[PDB]
Amino acid sequence: GPFTRRQAQAVTTTYSNITLEDDQGSHFRLVVRDTEGRMVWRAWNFEPDAGEGLNRYIRTSGIRTD
């Protein structure tokens, strides 16, 4: 479902197309960008299943190795 500040870092360490913004402590959202860095999808942290939408972008491919 949702993630943590630590988890976020790990997913963004993996996918540099992700970005941690709107940081207010525990209130923040990850901005999924494309290869260029265009905003494709930004999802919060405290969302019951934030990972649901994020993983749909990821599709176990991501912009990592691609």
Q: Phi-psi bin for 24: left (phi > 0), alpha (psi -120 to 50), beta? A: alpha
* Helix, strand, coil tally for the chain in percent (to 5): 30, 25, 50
R_g (Cα) of the chain, nearest Å: 11
CA distance 56 to 5: 20
Q: Catalogue all structural domains in the chain, each as residue range(s) with its CATH number.
A: 1-66 (3.30.160.130)
- Assess contact for 20 and 2: CB atoms under 8 A: no
- Assess contact for 12 and 18: CB atoms under 8 A: yes
Q: Which residues pair with 29 in a beta bridge?
A: 21, 44
* Exp. method: NMR
